[PDB]
Structure formats: structure tokens, C-alpha cells
Write a protein that binds this ligand. Structure first.
Ligand code: A1AH7
Lengths: 210, 212
């Protein structure tokens, strides 16, 4: 079964470079171009280029001429995308993709996506602050403030409270750190938000109380 | 570059509705147009190539049409797993270019936002910062507006907002507008209020408190 596996997420500082890889299995690797597309947070799709693994020939979007290099390693069925002189807008999920025609159907195959975070910030766990209720139903939550990089997870009551929960998409503050709020509704008649930040190993259960 | 322009950027429909979505190229591109579907947090799934030919596994209710500069994607009977964003793309000339998305959302009855207000926590004031949060829970449609006031001085900047996706059980939206200021500036003012305006409300609604 055709599969394309991408390298793991990365954080880079402005001006650095990143080399994302895309390993192909399940088909003849030298017969089909590998295409790279990116999507910045909340935006659309932008095309970077393709490389033909048969001959190593390339074509790039002019918007990246001089910053992007695409190479192949046929022996291990891997295509690479190296983006140099990284800037803040370069923050996006990067996808590799190919398209084949077996049987008689054209089929498309995609990687799982590689998050490239360009930021002068450094890894930091979040500080969790309670959002206590203030007098038929009550609302409460947690303010997960000042963490880097993404992502942070929030659960309530160790996973028992899934109903009426709204965890908001994170916002990037001018300080380069992320923050999101997570809220829940409960009748006016305990409650603990479980916050975990894998990049900093920060795990904080905070009980909310009025 | 060839510009691909999609319209509308969003649309509210219902299951069974017949949805039509357009895509226009700044130059004639023959039949070399593709359509993609994408779910949030997932890679795109290719739907159409050569303007009208479906990819493997793409249900027949997805049909493509067009030639030259005007193109169309048609969903004959909208099914619940079809709510997603849809991109067209040309590949007649380089660089390959996409249009912006056409997000396809669930229509439902108007809902007024339940407005709540939270003060900065003491754990946060001991830390030296101040974060006040205005919550807008369960409303429809997505469009809304929140405005802050400290001692009835209208606030500009140092306030950011985040809107969740359509709830899986009631298709409603929720918003969090977060206003952030110095502990010094927070103590220096008395009453705080956030004004919420939403077409499901007959007049502006305001929740407020007094500390600092
Ligand atoms: C970056 C997006 C993109 O543009 N593409 C793409 C799409 C999905 C997955 C991977 C690549 C294609 C491209 O690069 O354009 C030439 C890949 C080839 N299809 C040709 C379809 C066809 O006609 N197939 C049958 C021919 N016998 C046109 C689009």
C-alpha cells in the first residue's frame, strides 16, 4: 500500500534552514514527481515545487527561488525539501505528495505534514490560571498562557468531562508566545483542567473553584 | 502568476442541499484544473482532475465542470462528511496556483450568544500580569463583534480573539476575546465591561465588573 512518511516537526530561528524529508514506499519511486505544498496557520495552500526522482530535475515556485533546494536519494526512496533563510511567514505545515495511475484510476498520495515553526522564542511551558464562575448555568474555564511552541492539550476531570467543553484555537501574541483559553459550562450547582505541553514536558492539573 | 479566485469564501448549507462553487482563472487554462477537499488538521484529498474527472474513491455526487477561465464544483446532495473547505487549482502554467478556500458550513437557526465575563485571577496578579476574558458561548451565525471598555473608555489594541469551529452537537460557534494589560494599569482603573453585538440580539449586550 503506497505510503509517504515525512520527517518530524521542527522549530527554527529566523535566518536558519530546514530540511524536510518524505520517504516513499509501495510504488516505483523514480517514476513520479514528488510535490511540496505548504499551509500557514489559518491560510490556504501554496505550492513550493516538485522534483523528478528519475533524473533529479526540479521546478520551483519563483517566490522561493534561491531559498529552496529539493534533492532525492533513490537508494532509500526519499525526497528532501530544504528551505533556507527562514522568516516568520514561513511558519506552516509542509506536505509532500505524489499522484499515480494504477488500474485505471488516478490516485493521490499525501504525507502526514511537517510543522516548521520559525521563531526567536524558546521552549516554555504555560502558566495555567483559573477562570472561576461569578454567579441558570455557570461558566468556568482555564487560561493557558505563554507557552512555546505548539501544541498544548487541555482536558477536564482527567477525561471524564467531554460535554459542554470549548477549547479555543491558540493565539500568537506579539511576544512570540502562544495562549489559549478553554471553557466549560456547568449548572450553578469538582472540576480540574488537565494541561500538558509535550515540547516542555509541562503537565499542570489545576482545579477551578469560585 | 495566474490568479485563481473562488466565490463565495464561505457558504451555509444543509444536508441534501445542492451546493455549487465557482473558480475563475485570470488567464485561459484549458481544462487543467484540479479541486481539493481539506479538513482542519488534515492534508488535502484530491477530488477532481482535468476539470471534470474524479479521483479514485471520490463519490459520484462530486462533479466538476468548466473550461478556459470559468470552472465549477457541484455537490449533488450534500452529506454530513462533506462540510469542509474546497480549493481549486490550475496546472496549465507555472507557478502552480491555488485559489483561497471555499469553506462549507452547516446552516442552522439563529442563536443569541451567552455572554460571560471573567476577571484576572489572583494567581496571575501575584505574577504581575492581568488577563480579562469575555466569553461568547453558543451563537449562530459566526459573525459577531466584541468591544472592551475600562471606565467607559473604549479600548483599542491589546485585545485578541479566537473562535472555535462549529460544535459537533449543535453546530454553534463560541468566541473568546482576551484583553491583556499591565497589573499597574489594571489597578489604575475601576470598572471593566465587554460589549457583545450579534444579529441574534435586539440591542448590544454588556457584561461587566468592578475591581482593581
Ligand atoms: C501540488 C499539486 C499538483 O499540482 N498536482 C498534484 C496533486 C495531488 C497529489 C500530487 C500532485 C498535479 C501537478 O503537479 O500537475 C501536473 C499532479 C498531476 N496531476 C495530473 C492529473 C492527471 O491527469 N492524471 C492522469 C494522467 N494519465 C495534475 C496535478
Amino acid at each position: 500500500q503506497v505510503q509517504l512518511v515525512q520527517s518530524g516537526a521542527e522549530v527554527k530561528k529566523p535566518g536558519a534552514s530546514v530540511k524536510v524529508s518524505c520517504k516513499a514506499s509501495g510504488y516505483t519511486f523514480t517514476n513520479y514527481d514528488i510535490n511540496w505544498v505548504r499551509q500557514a496557520p489559518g491560510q490556504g495552500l501554496e505550492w513550493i515545487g516538485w522534483i523528478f526522482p528519475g533524473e533529479g530535475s526540479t521546478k520551483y515556485n519563483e517566490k522561493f527561488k534561491g531559498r529552496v533546494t529539493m534533492t532525492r536519494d533513490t537508494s532509500i526512496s526519499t525526497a528532501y525539501m530544504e528551505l533556507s533563510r527562514l522568516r516568520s511567514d514561513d511558519t506552516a505545515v509542509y506536505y509532500c505528495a505524489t499522484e499515480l495511475v494504477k488500474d485505471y484510476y488516478a490516485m493521490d498520495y499525501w504525507g502526514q505534514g511537517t510543522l516548521v515553526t520559525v521563531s526567536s522564542a524558546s521552549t516554555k511551558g504555560p502558566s495555567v490560571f483559573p477562570l472561576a464562575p461569578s454567579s441558570g448555568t455557570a461558566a468556568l474555564g482555564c487560561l493557558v498562557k505563554d507557552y512555546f511552541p505548539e501544541p498544548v492539550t487541555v482536558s477536564w476531570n482527567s477525561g471524564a468531562l467531554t460535554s459542554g467543553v470549548h477549547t479555543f484555537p491558540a493565539v500568537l501574541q506579539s511576544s512570540g508566545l502562544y495562549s489559549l483559553s478553554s471553557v466549560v459550562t456547568v449548572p450553578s450547582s469538582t472540576y480540574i483542567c488537565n494541561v500538558n505541553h509535550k515540547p516542555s514536558n509541562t503537565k499542570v492539573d489545576k482545579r477551578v473553584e469560585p | 502568476d495566474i490568479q485563481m479566485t473562488q466565490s463565495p469564501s464561505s457558504l451555509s448549507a444543509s444536508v441534501g442541499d445542492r451546493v455549487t462553487i465557482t473558480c475563475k482563472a485570470s488567464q485561459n487554462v484549458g481544462t487543467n484544473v484540479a479541486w481539493f477537499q481539506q479538513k482542519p488538521g488534515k492534508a488535502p484529498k484530491a477530488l477532481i482532475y482535468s476539470a471534470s474527472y474524479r479521483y479514485s474513491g471520490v463519490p459520484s455526487r462530486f462533479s466538476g465542470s468548466g473550461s478556459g477561465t470559468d470552472f465549477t464544483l457541484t455537490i449533488s446532495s450534500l452529506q454530513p462528511e462533506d462540510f469542509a473547505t474546497y480549493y481549486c487549482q490550475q496546472y496549465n502554467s507555472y507557478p502552480l496556483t491555488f485559489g483561497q478556500g471555499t469553506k462549507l458550513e452547516i446552516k442552522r437557526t439563529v442563536a443569541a450568544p451567552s455572554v460571560f465575563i471573567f476577571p484576572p485571577s489572583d494567581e496571575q496578579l501575584k505574577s504581575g500580569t492581568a488577563s480579562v476574558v469575555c466569553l461568547l458561548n453558543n451563537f449562530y451565525p459566526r459573525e459577531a463583534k466584541v468591544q472592551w471598555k475600562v471606565d467607559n473608555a473604549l479600548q483599542s489594541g491589546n485585545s485578541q480573539e479566537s473562535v472555535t469551529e462549529q460544535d459537533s452537537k449543535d453546530s454553534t460557534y463560541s468566541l473568546s476575546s482576551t484583553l491583556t494589560l499591565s497589573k499597574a494599569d489594571y489597578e489604575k482603573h475601576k470598572v471593566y465591561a465587554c460589549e457583545v453585538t450579534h444579529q441574534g440580539l435586539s440591542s448590544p449586550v454588556t457584561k461587566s465588573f468592578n475591581r482593581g
